[model samples]
Target: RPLPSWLRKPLGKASEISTVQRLVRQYGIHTICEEGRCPNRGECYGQKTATFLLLGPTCTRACAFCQVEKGHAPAAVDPEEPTKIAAAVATLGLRYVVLTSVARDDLPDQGAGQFVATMAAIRQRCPGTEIEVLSPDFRMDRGRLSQRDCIAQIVAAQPACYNHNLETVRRLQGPVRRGATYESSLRVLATVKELNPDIPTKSGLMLGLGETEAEIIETLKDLRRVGCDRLTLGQYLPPSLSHLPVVKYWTPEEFNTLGNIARELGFSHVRSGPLVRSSYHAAE
Candidate 1:
């Protein structure tokens, strides 16, 4: 099927987009907006906002729906990564920031340290700036830190919001996200709430991946069961020919219905539409 009208986005302002690209390139930082080829990048950057990808651009997991590069040993952890991101955040004068990373299962802390350090750096440089962390499962057993410990450390930092994406419904977990399990992903959110019930926990799922409406609703219920406070539902577009093909192009009306369902299910913040990504309009 051809690209739907609802999914098409007009080009963002050249100047605004270029300014974000310049700062990211100059600092040698990466944005999931670019790496994931997010459909909202142009608009988000045009608004002078971005989701920073930390640790490094390469990921340990090879999820079929993801565009981030995959490698067993991607890159050495840069000690100044946190500072560099902070510098860029300050330069952008952003009041809110979203920090995410590729799955860094290679690290002992599984990249949790980077998140803690980066959050500190951002707060230090941009005082009172709200930070949102979209982190990995940190559920691996071999690490020096227990999965809970890894999560505990980041939770200790107290981000404004903690987001871990379920990415897809339960039945499609294996093929859609190879290294992560459905239950494990849920545990990440559940643990966040357990660690700090005061902090709002968030999760997201990509539609158009061959899931039924019943599955989507069940996924929402599962998220609510874990006390997830926010939700994002968006259409999944393949990043390349090698990635999983989009199983359906859900229409705008359907998206609104889903959004309403999520609202009814008790999500404090819900962004549901073809253009909605995990961090899209997040500060709002």
Candidate 2:
């Protein structure tokens, strides 16, 4: 199989920045960028800016595309994590930070409270830094009334943006995103908008998994209908053969074309590319 010329990485080195590696290593922290160390390879792990994965870096649900270990938290979610995260923010002198967590369905709060807590820690440590969170649905589609409470609390914490990736188009949700449904994910984003319109609700998509151009456009419409204020569209590059295979590769030119489409649909911001992920360059 041949690969595309424009597709390599986020147009940078795989070398982790000195401070970034130190913070991650010292804290036993996991990041979406660290997935390159596993089967799920992402170019986003470069230099200082990164998407920090919370919840012990393990997942309870087996989202096929994700590379985080589908196993264990409290141990994974060290109480020390937030403190270190705070220290890292200050040491790095970051003005904006993006944090995400592996799905922790086993925990009663479904990982929401801990996520908020971590943010609070970051705020406490680096009040000057603006925060953005990429959180799970908390199984709002398959959870108790407590899920609602969790959602409310997360919104109350109020990061600069609340992002939950749709993962894939509606029809492909079944295989592409196991344990999640398109309607459920969409509703989660809607809930974020309803609760905190001021905190821009954002969503992202992974393309080239056998979706048609029409489906992509329809997904955009659905996002707007639900009041999503920001969008990210990236080409799907499976982290491993254990993950779903890429159906096709999209060119940078094609991404630009689709980015224009998303902007036309009224997303306040858009990042579309072969390497774009929800948290990639989110601070910008």
Candidate 3:
């Protein structure tokens, strides 16, 4: 079946080859755009607005929907990564930067310290740019780090926004995301708002994974209950044959309807469409 018009936007021009080369050599950074094979990479990199993947390329957990390589403990933290990231930001002349990391559950601080350090470094180097961090749950066992503390630690860094994707509705959570609970994800978003009411809290979900319209509305209600201020609802495009199959395709009109409903639900900003990813067109 053909994708809806909203999901069929043309890919933007490739980023300057020189810029990609510079980032790889200078920052030693990995990008989800590259590793996860995101469709929006060409446009984002072309605009010199790549999402920096920190900690390491390998992830601790194997989520069925994600394309990042699983297993293999990441190497010890590179103290220089922050400075290198700052240098790349300056080289690209970017006014806003998004930082994300692989799921490094093996780490003691869950890569929180490294993320904070990187954000601080960027601010010191490029004072004008706004920063955002899309982080992992960091709450594994019920006892390790309280959900509130995990959220609090990240909020302390004072980024312009904090995002943790719910990924899908409650029923599909287990099959799509291993070791992640739907309620836990909601709690994480709620904690972010509770701890730092001033900072904008964002969350996203992937549709067409056997979810119904009723479930989607329920999910939106859960988000609003948690004081979530920004939302991204995108079609779940399968990353690979190894990932879950696309159950259904939502049309552009359906996407628009959901977008309107989300806005009416009180989300301060809503990006709902088939092609929308968490950070798609976010630089604008």
Candidate 4:
């Protein structure tokens, strides 16, 4: 199917995009906007906003819907990343930031330490800034820290909000997100609430992946049951020919209905539309 009008975005300022890209590279930072080939990267980079992808560019898990590179062994953790990201935050003058990472099953803590350290460095450099962590499940079997223990460490650091994407409905988990389970993703959000009730829990879903309306509602209900406070729903665009195909292009009206359904389900905040993303306008 051709791109829908709602999903179509005009090219942004080339000069602005290049400048932000150069700056992020200067700090030795990796951003999901670039790696995931997010549709809104242009608008975001031009506005001097981005979602920082920690750990590395290569993801340990190969999700069919993702554009991030996949491999058996990803890069080693950069100890200086915390300082570098903090410096970038200071230079960008951003008051709110989102820190995310690839699945780093290679590490003992599954990359939780990087999130904690990066958040601390940002706090030290930009004391007024509020930080949000969009992290992996840190599933127990692959790491030294139990799921609870791993989540506890980040919760102790106190991110302003915690986010982990479900990506699709339970039925689609097998093909859409390999090496991650629907229940595991849900538990990640639940654990955040259990570890620290005060911290808001956030999650997202990508439409256009052959999910039924019923499945979408069921997923939203599942999120609410876990005490998810924030929600983001957007159309999923295939990153490349090798990735999962777009099963459908949900219309603008349908997204509006979905957004209303989420609000009625008691989500504190909802960003639902064709272009909405996990961290899109998240700071609001």
Q: Highest lDDT: which candidate?
A: 1
lDDT of 4 by residue, 25-77 (tens): 88898888777656676666555567898988787677889878886788778
lDDT of 3 by residue, 6-54 (tens): 5565433244455565566556777777676566766676766767788
Q: Any runs in candidate 1 off by more than 4 Å, and if so which? A: 9-15, 46-48
Query: Residue 66's C-alpha lDDT in candidate 4?
Result: 86
Instruction: Superpose all Cα atoms of candidate 1 onto the true structure and report the RMSD in Å to 1 decimal.
Output: 1.8
Per-residue alpha-carbon lDDT of candidate 1 for residues 1-284, written as tens digits (9 for 90 to 100): 67877665432213336677778889888888767656576667655568999877887667899878876677778999999999998997877789998877778888889999999999899976799999888777573688898899999999999999999999999899877899999999999888999989999999999999999999999999999999999888888888999889999899999999999999999999887889998887
Q: Tell me how far the alpha carbon of residue 151 in candidate 3 is from the true structure, in angstroms, after superposition.
A: 1.9
| lDDT at position 209, candidate 2 | 91
Task: Give TM-scores for every candidate, taking all chains together and pairing residue i with residue i.
Answer: 0.95, 0.90, 0.91, 0.94
Error of 1 at 275 (Å): 0.9
TM-score sort, best first: 1, 4, 3, 2
* Candidate 2 per-residue C-alpha lDDT over 1-284 given as tens digits, one digit per residue, 9 for 90 to 100: 35676765434434435556666677666666654552123333332356677776666666788777667343345777777777767776767778888766666677777778878988887766888888777774355436557778888997888888998888899898867788878888888777767878889998889898899999999999999989999888776779888889988888999999999989989999887778777866
Backbone clash pairs for candidate 2 read: 39-239, 40-239, 56-76
| CA lDDT of every candidate | 0.86, 0.76, 0.80, 0.86
Candidate 4 segments whose C-alpha is farther than 4 A from its true place:
10-15, 42-48, 140-143
Q: In model 2, where do residues sit more than 4 Å from their true spots?
A: 9-16, 37-48, 72-76, 140-145
